[PDB]
């Protein structure tokens, strides 16, 4: 019964209690806000090819 003197908690159960959650990448905040601010650029810039300024305030000609 030498196995009953070994630590009963497995090496697996250490690696799933220490590494419980997949950690958040540093770059996943950049490349997720950048793709969402690229829609703020598109709609709201005045130099974009798809501005909403002629759709929401139609021009007086």
């Amino acid at each position: 019964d030498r196995v009953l003197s070994l630590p009963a908690v497995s090496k697996n159960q250490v690696l799933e209690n220490v590494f419980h959650t997949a950690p958040k990448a540093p770059v996943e905040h950049l490349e997720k806000m950048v793709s969402a601010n690229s829609k703020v650029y598109d709609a709201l810039n005045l130099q974009s090819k798809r501005v909403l300024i002629w759709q929401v305030k139609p021009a007086l000609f």
């Binding site: 909403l52 759709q55 929401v56 305030k57 139609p58 007086l60 000609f61």
Partner: protein, 81 residues
């Protein structure tokens, strides 16, 4: 606007109110020396009292070029707001 308009060079604006554009009129009894100055450019012509009255003869009648309609663009401007 109506067919006949009765304004021009009488009780007119004599000067600009801003500084972005400098207006100077010089009214005589018959004509007026206007002097406009906007940015670097300048212009000064002679406007007769019967030259401003022919201005409102053919109307401009501005109208909005909308993507879909003026109604839709006012709802979409509110959703954008």
């Amino acid at each position: 606007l109506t067919t006949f308009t009765f304004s021009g060079l009488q009780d007119a604006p004599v000067a600009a109110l801003s500084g972005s554009i400098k207006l100077n009129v010089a009214a005589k009894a018959g004509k007026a020396e206007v002097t406009v100055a906007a940015g670097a450019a300048k212009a000064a012509t002679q406007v007769s009292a019967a030259a401003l009255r022919k201005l409102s003869g053919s109307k401009i009648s501005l109208a909005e070029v909308a993507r879909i309609s003026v109604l839709h663009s006012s709802i979409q401007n509110y959703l954008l707001s």
